[PDB]
Design a protein around this ligand. Structure first.
Ligand SMILES: Nc1ncnc2c1ncn2[C@@H]1O[C@H](COP(=O)(O)O)[C@@H](O)[C@H]1O
Ligand SMILES: Nc1ncnc2c1ncn2[C@@H]1O[C@H](COP(=O)(O)O)[C@@H](O)[C@H]1O
Ligand SMILES: Nc1ncnc2c1ncn2[C@@H]1O[C@H](COP(=O)(O)O)[C@@H](O)[C@H]1O
Ligand SMILES: Nc1ncnc2c1ncn2[C@@H]1O[C@H](COP(=O)(O)O)[C@@H](O)[C@H]1O
Lengths: 134, 146, 135, 147
């Protein structure tokens, strides 16, 4: 019965970044807001990626050298493009099944134009089950 | 030259549970204490499992070719997490663990390999002495910008 | 222009087990002959399974779980992976190498037209082939 | 009660190579000594990598997710390096997962089950190579509990 929209971390609570955001600033934001990942959007709040603390932890012949010179600079290069995402209308049980299958920490929630309206974490879902039981 | 002990959340600060603990209690404990997982210990403080929010996601309330043996086994485990009443039904028993004296970067590479949110830290008696999370390692990373 | 048949470990060299072979027996065979896995055949040498040192390593509602414990994990037939990925002696060595790369499997059993075990192609076989050929 | 050290292949029995070891030398070695992989060390016997028969399978002469930009570039360039490598450095996995000789055997065993690796190189406190624990060593250990 319940939806993603019911229990998702609302837009107002999100710590977003843009492809151009420096990897060091994403790192610092991540450590300071004590989150485990950051959604990535463009200037019109279209969701373009996700950057996990996993990605940052992973970060830390001529081809290798020219690659090293070019990346490890901006979120845009470190982010997983085209993330798996749900709708606010997506049924909550269904979403939880998606978390179970993908093992992802979070499923960003977008509208029909791919704009970022929320994030559904594991925490969201278990808290949900709790508030419901209560 | 740093180790797990330098950044692990220490024993006193840990929120633990036991296999006998009810699913309701552990859920309440995760959500109230805003943690993503809990170590599972016996009465002697011996680390016997880890239970993660991921494990909770399988609950009937929340959601919903291999050998004959592996198939049956997997299904029995699925039924157990689906209708589990105590932590023991849900946890992953015998977790991968590290020592306080494990080189920090080995722990990091273990976290990269396994993708686990956390590694329980035990002494040589297999007693629970801490928890190193991905967040701790990343915060160690930043904190060594020095 | 090299084939699996050229470099596989032939049938005559193989240590096999049957689905009725006890798991403990298989464990002993594996250790004693120092191999990492065993092909499983029936009485007519039809390849019916693979059982790996991995499977043995792994195997080493309380009531249901118990029942499952007693009923299975006794013989190879319940522990083997059924319907293994296999090749033919005519399979190009490069395609087989590439299948080893894709699947990460230690061995591809080699079977004839009737599905009878005639060999095993391991990573070792492929690496050795590369040595022998280079020379 | 058993440890990795109880069943590992010890330092004195190990076949090893370096990053600068040529692929031909390494392959020859694998074949000749009948092992499925080689620890890679530097001049001070610090463990710096592992090269496996798996890694040699990628060689041009043998076999010829949707991720971030960085990761994809790395994966490709690593694939090219393995395909055309001349030295072990081009093929090896650097910084492998490792255990201590005093690591409990069952913990090592569980690590082998989770990662599916064929072997865990065994190092001392300073990262020097002191052994190799294979899957085979573990299953043998499992049999030794015939007692
Ligand atoms: N919703 C998502 N869709 C696609 N990829 C994701 C998503 N969430 C995380 N990832 C990626 O999956 C990996 C694991 O991230 P995490 O789930 O945060 O541990 C990282 O490489 C992330 O960038
Ligand atoms: N240190 C660990 N060793 C073994 N399994 C684990 C460990 N940590 C978590 N798990 C399990 O791995 C799955 C994902 O947990 P998490 O790491 O919290 O995403 C769940 O089934 C956990 O019970
Ligand atoms: N050729 C094969 N076809 C299908 N499954 C296999 C094959 N070889 C191994 N397996 C299974 O894959 C897993 C890994 O085996 P191994 O490749 O021996 O590490 C074990 O469960 C094996 O039983
Ligand atoms: N202990 C280890 N730590 C990290 N990577 C490894 C380890 N052992 C093997 N690998 C790599 O994993 C792949 C499979 O190797 P194998 O375990 O020989 O099948 C190869 O790319 C190896 O280089």
């Amino acid at each position: 019965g319940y939806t993603v929209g019911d229990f998702m971390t609302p837009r107002q609570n999100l710590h977003v970044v843009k492809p151009s955001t420096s990897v060091d600033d994403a790192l610092e934001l991540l450590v300071e807001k004590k989150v485990t990942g950051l959604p990535v959007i463009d200037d019109n709040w279209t969701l373009v990626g996700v950057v996990s603390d996993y990605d940052l932890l992973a970060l830390d012949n001529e081809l290798q050298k020219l690659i090293s010179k070019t990346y490890g600079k901006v979120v845009g290069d470190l982010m997983t493009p085209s993330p798996l995402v749900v709708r606010d209308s997506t049924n909550l049980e269904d979403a939880a099944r998606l978390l179970l299958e993908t093992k992802f920490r979070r499923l960003p929630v977008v509208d029909a134009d791919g704009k970022l309206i929320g994030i559904l974490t594991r925490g969201n879902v278990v808290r949900a089950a709790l508030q419901i039981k209560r």
